[PDB]
């Protein structure tokens, strides 16, 4: 058997490697619940000037 | 202006952050240069 062991070192540095992140389609003019990259809030997402 | 450390206001946009976490106390620069003669 070819054996690969994925061990890890943690808790001694700012974490740098981990899994991917989900992505969904946006929408406008409707009270939704956004989670923009760090910002979890609720409201209407119009466009900007 | 020519030589004086100028008076006037500006800002400093960020370049980069890095996760390093090392013991740091000192720094030296590097200069481009021959030894017994050069042009700069």
Swiss-Prot record, chain B:
Glycans are attached at residue 23. It comes from the Viruses. Changing residue 37 to S: In strain: Omicron/BA.2.75. Attaches the virion to the cell membrane by interacting with host receptor, initiating the infection. The major receptor is host ACE2. When S2/S2' has been cleaved, binding to the receptor triggers direct fusion at the cell membrane. When S2/S2' has not been cleaved, binding to the receptor results in internalization of the virus by endocytosis using host TFRC and GRM2 and leading to fusion of the virion membrane with the host endosomal membrane. Alternatively, may use NRP1/NRP2 and integrin as entry receptors. Binds to host ACE2. RBD also interacts with the N-linked glycan on 'Asn-90' of ACE2. Cleavage of S generates a polybasic C-terminal sequence on S1 that binds to host Neuropilin-1 (NRP1) and Neuropilin-2 (NRP2) receptors. Interacts with host integrin alpha-5/beta-1 (ITGA5:ITGB1) and with ACE2 in complex with integrin alpha-5/beta-1 (ITGA5:ITGB1). May interact via cytoplasmic c-terminus with M protein. May interact (via N-terminus) with host bilirubin and biliverdin, thereby preventing antibody binding to the SARS-CoV-2 spike NTD via an allosteric mechanism. This is Spike protein S1. It comes from Severe acute respiratory syndrome coronavirus 2. The gene is S.
């Amino acid at each position: 058997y070819r054996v690969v062991v994925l061990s890890f070192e943690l808790l001694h540095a700012p974490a740098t490697v981990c899994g991917p992140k989900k992505s969904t389609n946006l929408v406008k003019n409707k009270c939704v619940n956004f989670n923009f990259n760090g910002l979890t809030g609720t409201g209407v997402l119009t466009e900007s000037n | 202006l020519v030589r004086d450390l100028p008076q006037g206001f500006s800002a400093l946009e960020p370049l980069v952050d890095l996760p390093i976490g090392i013991n740091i106390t000192r720094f030296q620069t590097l200069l481009a240069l021959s030894s017994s003669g050069w042009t700069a």
